[PDB]
Design a protein around this ligand. Structure first.
Ligand SMILES: [Zn+2]
Ligand SMILES: [Zn+2]
Ligand SMILES: [Zn+2]
Ligand SMILES: [Zn+2]
Lengths: 175, 110, 180, 180, 112, 177, 112, 180, 175, 180, 175, 112
């Protein structure tokens, strides 16, 4: 399944990693089209004028969300990436609203990245400071270093963390 | 300013000024804005400003003692719900901190 | 491109810590607590005690935070004032931010505020106590090495062998210099 | 501890550059002008056009500066509001300080302000014009090296033997990447 | 309503579209009952109308003022008066000329 | 008598002598005062066991208070620390050494050490000299803990026509005029 | 060139010939970056520009200022701002009306 | 030992009256307004429009006063220049003093200046209008007596029994002789 | 109760009269000694070295100020005299200060009257032009004419004055 | 309509006199000299000692007059400044005008200045000495009569009988009133 | 011929009186036409449109000067009127210049008396303070008092006055 | 301190306590090289320092000015020179002695 790991010891190429932390910075919010069967990126062919998905033939794509933010737990800082319905659940805003807002921002004369960053820093600034437990895989990007791509996130279980910290206190040797 | 300190109502100290309580409501008087809080060791009549708790809702209150000739009543400032809560860990951590703080703060030098 | 992780503190650790402000452009301001811990970003949990006072032109916004050991000012200037609008008096918030000093009184420049549940507050107390104990024992075992020789290659090697992080020696040296 | 020198600028260039905000801790904010010049600190000379506005509780202070090509706000927060009291309307001041952005309008966070003699104003004009000419020429020479060849070690050697600073190529690359 | 810079201009060269101008001259006449003075810089004479303060006669000043243009005439409403008595004027005109002949060409160089 | 030489802050190196630098005051580090001989104006030592000040040039002399100023100079191409001694310090600041000594004493009576009192005095009362153009002369030394330091013998205010002449010459070298 | 007195007028009836006016209103919005405020006395809204001082929002003021009439618009350049917070406005309007209805007739009476 | 009371006037009437200068020692200067009213001392309420001008050696001091009907200069020579220092720009003052003429332009030689509340300004308006109307009526009645009959011992009796002051006929005749 | 009357109709010997006006001149300001119980003029005896108040026996002198000014209201001019703490309130300066100033002037070699006049005309000249309402009784001094001995003074109530002027206009027949 | 005549004085009499300023409107200011003489308008003859100082805006003009006994200021305000232009330093002038006091020093408010010849100056000396002697003897005659009864009907009648002008009794009465 | 008289003792109807004094105020300077040979006022008769002198027939009038000023002595103040060439000698300005000055003043909107007063108080202010001797006859005017209409004037003689005051001093009894 | 009055004396009676001198006398010699001239009152000769104006031989003159007492000699720092060609000097002398005789007694008599 998933293996618990500390941010201090995260290394590239690791798989099935569980981290707990708090959100410290939000970088990007974006939406883009994907296949309605495998939820995978579809290529808009100029010669055909349609969105081809080279695993199910021609399909009609649907919008899905991508979120880029940062996690900290007191021992390190890791940039993390959240996908699809998890981002909608975390943010609480339906994806079509994000799409409409980002087109409205880009209509003023901003590129895709500028609109994404402005939208992240101007509306979804209220999620940072909140705790989150992420499960995912560690990838290395040549320009950004370590990125934890989270398959899913689930709220912190207080009792499990309390018993973990108590057992670590026993390892310390107070009781 | 004075930080808020938490205890039991039966162990209220005359030197202490600001109090934090976690307790059980039994009754409330609207006209005087009184209500009763029970922490398991005693019952305190504490004065909410405008909020009013419900019977069956465990209440945490941050307030100030008013030691007058009218009785012992707490000038409550903050009222919050703790009905979904554990406290055995609360007494555990309070006694742990109380036991190890005095030597810890005296440990090391400069 | 490296961000020093925020560290979790009591309010008292900040109040009578030592504020060290850097002079170079490529170095940030920091704090050295009483028991020789270097702190860059504070990360506190506590209840709010008073209404958020925000300027009508919303240039500045500040409020008070209390948890049981002291009362700290949380500030936001220019763009950050939005955070001061997120809170109301009476609830428990987690505040993460930087440390700055104004009129011989410490304060926190806000970077994020979030409403939270009391069990998180008790977990905060647990984590603060755990972090305090380990560093206090590490400082205790490093004091002997510091008072033995000083900052020398042999001292660095023996500290590495004993398992003590190197930067504690320099932090102790700077604190010792600040004392006198 | 390294402190970067301040550059003498036209207010028009400050108001028309691109503000790059650092994300790490050990890097400061900066601004890239229209002709590929990185600036960390600004230093301008001009006339104060309005009475300084100081908040009732002296938490901040500001004033406007005009020199002939633009009009810019100069700010000071917390204890730097003292500087906002050293000047009055009609003065001929010299201001040195960092560059900040708020509500898509550039502003200067003041570090020092001091009155000058009109001959100092004329020196400001001469010296800023020469300092602009020199860098315009160097950037015009380096742009061809960037476009024909790119970012390679051999391109760095070419720039070295042609008399152009190494960092200028990276600045041009960043300007291209921000203007794309 | 962005604030406009004081477009530095000669007395004889004041255009029609100007809204704020900055002049340098020497005073030749001052009228205290009406609070006015006459500024003469060599190429013309301008009737500057002060609000509360007046300069002396014979000293060189620099006046930053808002231009009021009605059927009554043209007169500069002085806002800022600075004493430029011991300033170097020849070097100032030389640098103004150099800047004027160079800067318009400079902006055209380089691309993106 | 050796003459002084202009030199850009960018290319000055340790061990140079008779260096002249024009710049803007960008930071005020410290202002302090201490005792010196009333004849040769040199550092004299007060002995606790002897209760007197000993000048190793004149014997026993009565101490006189003189100030030291420590600031930073910036001129578009670099940043360098500068230290001023004695008379020039109160000439630049405009405050006699007696007042500085009294203020340091009052600061120390609040429980602050010498360094903290000096820094607070520099940053709380003499902050109005930042942003001033000056031309300093002195010798450049290298302190193992602070880097390059320019110890100044004298300072003067600038000279707006000579500087314009220099800038015109440099523009002529570029080839515009 | 005697300066004209401040002809006291309501916002809705500022005629074209006026060069200086004196208005009484209550502030409704203040902009500090541009130093402007909106004056509203019930019959209109006027965008009053200021040089150095601004009033607070919600208080009644009396503003004596010039007229700047260009194609950019018509904005009143405030010269004197006075705090009329606790003045009896109904008595003021009654006396204004009575003065207006009486004085033009009074001057006609008597002869040489 | 008699002092004539001061009258409350519009600045227009002060600026449009005829100034009569006495030649004897035991008579003061005065002014006859357009409706046959002799005034010895003036008393006006209005706004100071400009900062007072005081000579470098405090020989004299002056300031301008506006009330909505005219703008008048107020002067003080020798030791009365002290009054010119009691006011600044924008205040709403009340001025009492004599009337003087210099270069065909009426001016007030100040005897006292003092700030007032806006309600005092409204009282000034009410009172000046009311006391103008009374004298207009009385002069209109007395003008017919003067025109039909003239100055005769019986004309004095007629004016006495009609309720009109005796001096009014004399001032009417003086006005006729001055404006003829 | 008091009666409001215009200065034109003030006759000698009338009592309980109230006058509205403007301060047109400041004649004198000075200090003297009075009983600490009745606040009445007491006599210091050189041969006895004590102050005698013949309803009080021996008492310790206290300082009382006299202010002497002139009031004008468009129809006349009348002298007014204020006593004790009322002058202290109107001037705003404690009687000990006036006493020490007049002493300092007397030390210059100037008589009492001249020192009082110079103090009035060189320091308290800023009250000229102030609009007030005084109350008292009128007396006929053989060297000065009519004098109004004020018992109390107050500030003007502007709304009532507007009401009075409106009533007068209504009687005239315009409103 | 009465212009009562000017009187001729030494400078010391004016400087060491008693300035009595009137309070009523129908009475002018005057001077009472040491030997009980009432003076309204001074008429002096003497040489000018320094250059006439006149304001550039010609509001005021003043100069010094010397005759060997003292130094006197001759002033002219507003329209009278023309007189200050009629004189040049080094000549003998006759000056006629009123007396006024400014900063406990006597000065003459000018009303007429004319160039004169030395022989009329010695005529001036003759006339002032003769008038001084005559009034001195009259005052000596009146002293014992004043000290006899005071101001009574019998004293007035006897003074009339032996030929003393009545106003002298009042002049010494006021002198006694002001000396105390 | 002419007899000396003190100003204090001047009475109405007195004849052939000379006084010595100083000019204290100038009232007016004017000109008007008169018969060229006998120096008398000529009337511009509207019935004939010519200037008639009703003692010599038709004549062509010439302009002459009239000057009203004030003389003082230290014992009293009197008004003095000079006529014709005497005024020209005293002032030094030919009557035609006064004529054009008067008409220019009148063209601005001023009456004849206003122009006279303005000219007297604006340009002829430099004769005040000069010593003079006046000779003439005293007349009484109902609204103006005593006017010493001067037939002639001369510069004051010094030796005669010195000897007169010397003999007055001998009468005093000093030498 | 006010400025002192002038005191008139003769050459032979120049007192040490005198400060400023008025003299009437005869020119006998003028030296333009040093701007000096000799003045004779009859009882002696005094050297007078002319500043810019110089009299003529045959013109009897009166000088008001300052005395300079140094080790080199006694010379008068002249301030004003005037023509008295015509003058009754005997009358001046007789009135001077008459004044010196009576004025000291005149001041003493009549107490207050
Ligand atoms: Zn698919
Ligand atoms: Zn020594
Ligand atoms: Zn008593
Ligand atoms: Zn004839």
């Amino acid at each position: 399944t998933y293996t618990r790991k500390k941010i201090k010891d995260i290394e590239a190429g690791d798989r099935f990693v569980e981290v707990r932390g708090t959100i410290a910075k939000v970088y990007r919010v974006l939406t883009y089209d994907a296949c309605p069967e495998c939820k995978k990126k579809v290529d808009y062919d100029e010669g055909l004028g349609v969105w081809i998905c080279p695993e199910h033939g021609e399909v009609q794509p649907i919008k899905m969300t991508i979120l880029d933010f940062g996690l900290d737990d007191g021992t390190g800082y890791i940039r993390v990436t959240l996908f699809g319905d998890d981002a909608e659940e975390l943010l609480g805003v339906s994806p079509e609203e994000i799409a409409e807002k980002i087109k409205e921002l880009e209509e003023s004369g901003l590129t895709t990245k500028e609109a994404a960053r402005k939208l992240a820093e101007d509306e979804f600034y209220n999620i940072i400071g909140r705790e989150i437990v992420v499960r995912g895989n560690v990838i290395e990007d040549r320009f950004l270093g370590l990125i934890l791509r989270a398959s899913s996130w689930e709220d912190v279980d207080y009792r499990r963390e309390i018993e973990r910290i108590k057992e670590e206190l026993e390892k310390l040797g107070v009781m | 300013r004075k930080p808020a300190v938490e205890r039991k109502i039966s162990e209220i100290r005359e030197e202490d000024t600001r109090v934090s309580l976690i307790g059980r409501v039994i009754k409330v008087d609207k006209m005087d804005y009184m209500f009763w809080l029970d922490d398991g060791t005693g019952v305190a009549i504490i004065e909410s400003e405008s909020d009013l708790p419900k019977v069956g809702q465990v209440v945490r209150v941050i307030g100030r003692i008013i030691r007058n000739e009218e009785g012992i009543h707490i000038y409550a400032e903050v009222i919050q719900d703790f009905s979904d809560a554990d406290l055995e860990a609360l007494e555990e951590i309070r006694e742990l901190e109380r036991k190890l703080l005095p030597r810890l703060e005296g440990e090391i030098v400069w | 491109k490296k961000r020093m992780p925020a560290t979790r503190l009591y309010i008292k650790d900040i109040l009578e810590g030592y504020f060290v402000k850097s002079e170079g452009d490529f170095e940030p301001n920091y704090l050295i607590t009483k028991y020789a811990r270097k702190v860059y970003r504070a990360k506190i949990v506590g209840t709010v005690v008073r209404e958020p006072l925000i300027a009508e032109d919303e240039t500045y916004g500040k409020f008070q935070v209390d948890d049981g050991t002291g009362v700290i000012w949380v500030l936001g200037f220019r763009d950050d004032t939005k955070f001061a609008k997120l809170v109301r008096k009476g609830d428990l918030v987690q505040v993460i931010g930087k440390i700055a000093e104004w009129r011989d009184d410490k304060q926190i420049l806000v970077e994020g505020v979030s409403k939270v549940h009391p069990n998180m507050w008790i977990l905060h107390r647990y984590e603060t106590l755990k972090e305090k104990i380990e560093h206090i024992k590490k400082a205790k075992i490093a004091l002997e090495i510091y008072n033995q020789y000083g900052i020398t290659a042999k001292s660095k090697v023996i500290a590495k062998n004993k398992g003590i992080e190197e930067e504690l020696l320099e932090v102790i040296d700077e604190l010792y210099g600040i004392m006198m």
